[PDB]
Design a protein around this nucleic acid. Structure first.
Ligand SMILES: [Ca+2]
Ligand SMILES: [Ca+2]
Lengths: 239, 126
RNA sequence: AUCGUAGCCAAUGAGGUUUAUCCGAGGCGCGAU
């Protein structure tokens, strides 16, 4: 009672979500503006961070491609030479000093945002593993914090049946899918195994939540056991 | 070797366990039984539980220790029996059951036996 | 798919198009049609 921790962690975890939204609005912006200079580059470097690092490295000067030690820290040597080739047969043209400032500032901000996301998640992983270690082991700290938020804490969560925990955070997208359905672990599966995976993961989350609500198995014994049980069922469903 | 978790309170003796399992079997026959901790939880939140029976050898025991708390909320009698195998056997089910709930049914031919068990339980909870 | 199901999984939840903060005992394999 009186300013409980979980709420602070739930809202910290929520920041990373806001940070991701800004991060790909910036990616979309950077890819749009850099397209004047090197329209092809976007389809050669799909990954957002690599792309941003690449436009930051190159700027106007596309012959910084050959033998560039800093570029070799971003791109595969094979994809370097494919962009170096694509660079000369080019289309795009030079940017003004003001067009460059625009991109450079956006790239620096994106890099800064990416590091903040990591430093906030570290906090969230650290504190979730004190608040609800067994739950966190199964669905990650982020999903655990999301469901704990909507439930209004661990005691409340722990007195819900598994079938309602499954539907926590449910919302024209996909019917009967909650935070659990959209967790990394469930989403890691083929589409056709997801509803069934959410059921299984929901059921074991409920069990873990209850153990956490009583502050037992604080080194995560129960969570790692349930995690192992889930993994072995996933293996058995697949080929 | 090894029995029994002190937190499984109150625990029925041999004579009460026999009564409980008998009545749980009848409840099943008369369509007044919910099997499973999850469904038990639902009966309590909805106020349709006559009483709750849980298994003392649920591991870990905390996967059902929310039930006594819920029951205290709802002024609903609960008891533990030693064996989840036996409870599932009494639930007409072919796997252990760690918790079940006999449900309120207006005009139940079982009112008298249910009322009796409630008293049996209540006098352990002091 | 249906019937038979002496092996496997399953109320610590089967399997969920309907009613999903809602439902609650089946599914798999096997044999036959
Ligand atoms: Ca990389
Ligand atoms: Ca009382």
């Amino acid at each position: 009672e009186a300013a409980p921790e979980y709420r602070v962690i739930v809202d910290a975890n929520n920041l990373t979500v806001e940070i991701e939204n800004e991060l790909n609005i910036i990616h979309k912006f950077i890819r749009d503006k850099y397209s004047k200079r090197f329209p092809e580059l976007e389809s050669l470097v799909p990954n957002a961070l690599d792309y941003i690092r690449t436009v930051k490295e190159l700027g106007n000067s596309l012959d910084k491609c050959k033998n560039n030690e800093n570029l070799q820290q971003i791109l595969t040597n094979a994809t370097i030479m494919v962009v170096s080739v694509t660079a000369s047969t080019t289309q795009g043209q030079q940017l003004s000093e003001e067009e460059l400032e625009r991109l450079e500032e956006a790239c620096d901000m994106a890099l800064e945002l990416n590091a903040s996301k990591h430093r906030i998640y570290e906090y969230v992983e650290s504190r979730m593993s004190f608040i609800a270690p067994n739950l966190s082991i199964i669905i990650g700290a982020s999903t655990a914090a999301k469901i704990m938020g909507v439930a209004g804490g661990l005691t409340n969560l722990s007195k819900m049946p598994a079938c309602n925990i499954m539907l926590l955070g449910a919302q024209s997208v996909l019917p009967h899918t909650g935070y659990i359905y959209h967790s990394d672990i469930v989403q890691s599966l083929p589409p056709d195994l997801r509803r069934k995976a959410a059921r299984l993961v929901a059921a074991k989350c409920t069990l873990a939540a209850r153990v956490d609500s009583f502050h037992e198995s604080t080194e995560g014994k129960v969570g790692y056991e349930l995690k192992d049980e889930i993994e072995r069922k996933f293996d058995k469903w697949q080929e | 070797e090894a029995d029994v978790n002190p937190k499984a309170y109150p625990l029925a003796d041999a004579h009460l366990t026999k009564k409980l399992l008998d009545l749980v079997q009848q409840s099943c026959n008369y369509k007044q039984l919910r099997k499973g901790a999850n469904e038990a939880t639902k009966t309590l939140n909805r106020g349709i539980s006559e009483f709750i029976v849980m298994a003392a050898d649920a591991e870990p025991l905390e996967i059902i220790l929310h039930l006594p708390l819920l029951c205290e909320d709802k002024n609903v009698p609960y008891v533990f029996v030693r064996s989840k195998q036996a409870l599932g056997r009494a639930c007409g089910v072919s796997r252990p059951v760690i918790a079940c709930s006999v449900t309120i049914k207006e005009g139940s031919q079982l009112k008298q036996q249910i009322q009796s068990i409630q008293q049996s339980i209540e006098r352990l909870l002091v």
